[model samples]
Target: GPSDFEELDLDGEMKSTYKEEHPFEKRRSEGEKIRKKYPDRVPVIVEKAPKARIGDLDKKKYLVPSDLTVGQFYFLIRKRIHLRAEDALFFFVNNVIPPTSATMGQLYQEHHEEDFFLYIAYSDESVYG
Candidate 1:
């Protein structure tokens, strides 16, 4: 005799009943707040994606998205004002942005052009790779 088709229908029904609900709507507002708070902090690899598997031995010379050179621009400002490294990194990652507003002038003023140039060179090398 053929199996009952109703039982097979029950199996599919159970799977549909257990489906997970999408949470995007629930998190949308919180995500917006976070984005506003850190407008300039692009993803770690927003500019360049590393194609090579660099080991510790050669990592210092290799350009990296989160490399210290990226942070160096902040360091230059922090050094002049004697801010801690942690604070500098935080402010730079969270606050700094291109086409900066007037409020950011103080931080920019403290940045040393020479150090910034060096940082740009390092960043460019990583981008080229």
Candidate 2:
């Protein structure tokens, strides 16, 4: 049998355009806390690529549950990570997916290492020198 998620190419969604189309126009979903309802949680450590200038250029950790949709996960990221609406955001794991509706637990398991941590990389294409 084949593994559930695999990186088909080194350029997975590298040329994607959904970054600028964040579903929320205003701060409408800020009140929707992802960590509130879910009691069971996993620790995920997000490692940003140097080119991802959205949030701090440092590693960050988050306690997320298994029920998190990749989309809302991005929303939660928007809550924690800083970026302009016009900024094109790119997110992927070791084996990139199209930000599918998969749960974080499934995603974290794929990218997590032996240290009980999952790594995520993000980049912004709208930034300039």
List CA RMSD, all candidates.
20.4, 12.7
Q: What's the lDDT for residue 72 in model 2?
A: 81
**lDDT score of residue 50 within candidate 1:** 26
lDDT values of the candidates? 0.27, 0.55
Prediction 1 global C-alpha lDDT: 0.27
- Taking the tens digit of each residue's C-alpha lDDT, what string does model 2 give over 80-124? 666667666666665354455878887766655444445566656
Query: Which is the leading candidate under lDDT?
Result: 2
Candidate 2: deviation at residue 112, Å?
1.7
- Angstrom error of the Cα, residue 63, model 1: value is 20
Which 10-residue window in model 1 sums to the lowest lDDT?
Answer: 115-124
Error of 1 at 33 (Å): 0.6
Candidate 1 per-residue lDDT, tens place, 4-79, comes to 4444222221111111232435334443553356443311201111232221111111122222343453344345
